[PDB]
Design an enzyme around this catalytic site. Sequence first.
Site, PDB file in Angstrom:
ATOM      1  N   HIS A 262      57.318 136.715  45.200  1.00 20.54           N
ATOM      2  CA  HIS A 262      56.773 135.481  45.751  1.00 20.54           C
ATOM      3  C   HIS A 262      57.643 134.874  46.847  1.00 20.54           C
ATOM      4  O   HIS A 262      57.177 133.970  47.549  1.00 20.54           O
ATOM      5  CB  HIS A 262      56.529 134.446  44.642  1.00 20.54           C
TER       6      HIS A 262
ATOM      7  N   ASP B 270      56.745 140.823  39.821  1.00 25.26           N
ATOM      8  CA  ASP B 270      57.407 139.884  40.726  1.00 25.26           C
ATOM      9  C   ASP B 270      58.707 140.471  41.267  1.00 25.26           C
ATOM     10  O   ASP B 270      59.785 139.893  41.133  1.00 25.26           O
ATOM     11  CB  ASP B 270      57.658 138.539  40.044  1.00 25.26           C
TER      12      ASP B 270
ATOM     13  N   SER C 210      66.103 131.308  42.580  1.00 29.79           N
ATOM     14  CA  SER C 210      65.081 132.329  42.395  1.00 29.79           C
ATOM     15  C   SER C 210      65.349 133.512  43.315  1.00 29.79           C
ATOM     16  O   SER C 210      65.691 133.344  44.489  1.00 29.79           O
ATOM     17  CB  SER C 210      63.694 131.747  42.669  1.00 29.79           C
TER      18      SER C 210
END
Lengths: 295, 295, 295
Positions: free
Chosen positions: A45, A81, A160
């Site tokens: 993402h 992901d 992240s």
Amino acid sequence: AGRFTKVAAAVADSVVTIESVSDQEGMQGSGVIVDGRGYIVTNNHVISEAANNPSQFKTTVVFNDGKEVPANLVGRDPKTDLAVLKVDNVDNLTVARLGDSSKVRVGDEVLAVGAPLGLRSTVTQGIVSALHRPVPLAGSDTDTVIDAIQTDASINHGNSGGPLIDMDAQVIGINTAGLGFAIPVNEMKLVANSLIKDGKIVHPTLGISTRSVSNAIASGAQVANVKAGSPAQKGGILENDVIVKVGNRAVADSDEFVVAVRQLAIGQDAPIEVVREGRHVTLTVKPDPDSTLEH
Amino acid sequence: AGRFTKVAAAVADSVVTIESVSDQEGMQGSGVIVDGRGYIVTNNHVISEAANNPSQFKTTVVFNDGKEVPANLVGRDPKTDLAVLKVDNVDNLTVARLGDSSKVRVGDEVLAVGAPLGLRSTVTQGIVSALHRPVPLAGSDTDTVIDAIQTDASINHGNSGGPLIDMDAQVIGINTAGLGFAIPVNEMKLVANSLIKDGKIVHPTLGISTRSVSNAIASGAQVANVKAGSPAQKGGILENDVIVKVGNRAVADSDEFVVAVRQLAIGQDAPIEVVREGRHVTLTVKPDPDSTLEH
Amino acid sequence: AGRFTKVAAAVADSVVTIESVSDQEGMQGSGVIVDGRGYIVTNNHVISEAANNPSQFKTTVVFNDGKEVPANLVGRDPKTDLAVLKVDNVDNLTVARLGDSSKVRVGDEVLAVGAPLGLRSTVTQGIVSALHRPVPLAGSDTDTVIDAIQTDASINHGNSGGPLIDMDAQVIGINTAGLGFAIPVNEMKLVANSLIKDGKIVHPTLGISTRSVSNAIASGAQVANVKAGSPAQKGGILENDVIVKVGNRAVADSDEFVVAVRQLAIGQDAPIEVVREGRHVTLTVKPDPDSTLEH
């Protein structure tokens, strides 16, 4: 030097900032250097919109020396992901020491490290709260469920894509913000090796839509739809069935069902255990690949 | 005794409760004794309403012995969320040991200590997550941005105004709740010394309103308005300009712009770097004081 | 083995999963084995609906070996969020080592352990943030206030009902999710011993409804209603009175008022201190039992 301060400074050179910019937008994330040839792992993402619109987005990698280098996308898997980037002809790269997430135990102290030069980056501390925990993750990319490491260290926009680090300065997971969850490093090593090698990753599919159900009769994943021509239609799976076991893994909810299907072998027969109107029925299904041409 | 328990008990006598009461209201916060003459540092939003309405509010300081003593306001700075109180003729005061926030590093274990006798006070633990991080803070007082210490220890109503403590029981920051952020102690020492000495603190001003912008051309603080007669109008700054550097500090957003302006010298010429319709223009501005009579 | 990992594995066999299922519902929580005869302590809201509808709910206890055993309800106290379950004729039970919550100090490192086989269970880490902190707790059961241990370790659905553990692997509290709060073990030992012994727990009552008030005149619990025939009506307590002390405990708000009333003796005279229109009035009230037949 503090005990966590020492570990954080040791892995800082291995963590990089990933900047994707357009003419009227931008997006930043974190990444980890896993190979001396310039291979960088982040989560999908961070780069998703640059992959879906490569004509209008530019992706650069910023090292901890301030050096800014253009990046190229090797491959990406929205179902875990994960994504792999490549910087070319960069020398003296400090590569991260990857660990074994199968040797990780609940209570182990961890660090969730973000890119030091990131705009609003973070380094957080906690313990491993749970192992093998299915967690759902939500642009035009698909929603997925990963079987993840749970931690009470804060995972957020600032860390992240960076690494989850043990007290030996070893990468044991990839933080994802899509209370804290991380992708196990062993899962990351499979996906990354396949993405480097082929540029794609083929996951099994059965053609089932499910919802979660829990009562005194049977608990699990209730079949909401069976696709036409799917392996499930050929195997006998019907709507309103309750899948309680997929292969060698029990299924407590629709989230664990998604994880267990990805653990099956493509093209090999598999047992599926189902409660149908008060009767336990054991079905046999052969998983198909989600991408036939890339497989 | 536990390792954090030892540090918390050592600084407890230096942390005080600050109670501001009216005929139909009340407000509590925490404070730190920084001088044996009775000088107490808290953040500005604890005492803000007592300063704007001194005729109807009474401010007392409650020590950790249960002793309640009336307090007097020496000065306050809403632009750094800092304030200085004074208790008179109180003896045997345990003064807090102030540290050097320039010697603090990411990963250092910290404690966010609140006043022990506070109603709903807290002592939380974590690590330093980021350094030199601009964070916006929001009654009738102005909104501001401070260049702060970020921590994963919870800062809340119970420990706001109290100290951020290192493992040597030294105050390295002032917790503010206006995930966790603290005012560096070196910043606190400047503001407090000026507030004790003059009762005021004069900060630089340029007369610019900005918004944040980030794309592939230029990223920074876009000029939204130039005030009349301001130093910016005299220096050549125009609307829709993008300030990328203020003095010796790069500016990534409107928040870092506010912090960098306060780092300039009042009355001295300063370089301002601007992207104007695709051209880099370097302007020279002389900062004015925000308070001319107190300066 | 890590320092917290060692403590977590030592208490894991003492923590159990509690599953309550109906024909169209389910509910899971955590519990602690406190006696070798099969006595399990959880909080009341885990089992509340199974107690109010025992004809349609089945409650089982799942040990950490995977063993599933039916459970029976010994007793439950909604006013302290505590409940006691009993499993019959189970051998080789690893019983939890209970501690002394009066020996606990702010800053002590703690672990909030959940049931390892729970669906979405958690093990979190932090310190004790506050002691003797009144906290309100909210099906058809009553809302209550407990005088609790506050911690910065996350208490959530995955570890509620499990133990709060010190660094000696001793249970010092029961986590409740009804930022983190736990029921002290000494409070738990009283309630559990009474529930095992009689099946009920009789708490004092006065017949007062209160609201919180804080200003410069008097701060405390303002009487909102006096029940008819109550001990308060007999003692002289009137509406709009402000209770500032209940027995030997000062009362800062309506929440501390609820806790202090439960610390009084049933049937013994008690002093109640009240501010009535600017005058301090000391009243004497005799607490009644909330359950006359069970007492």
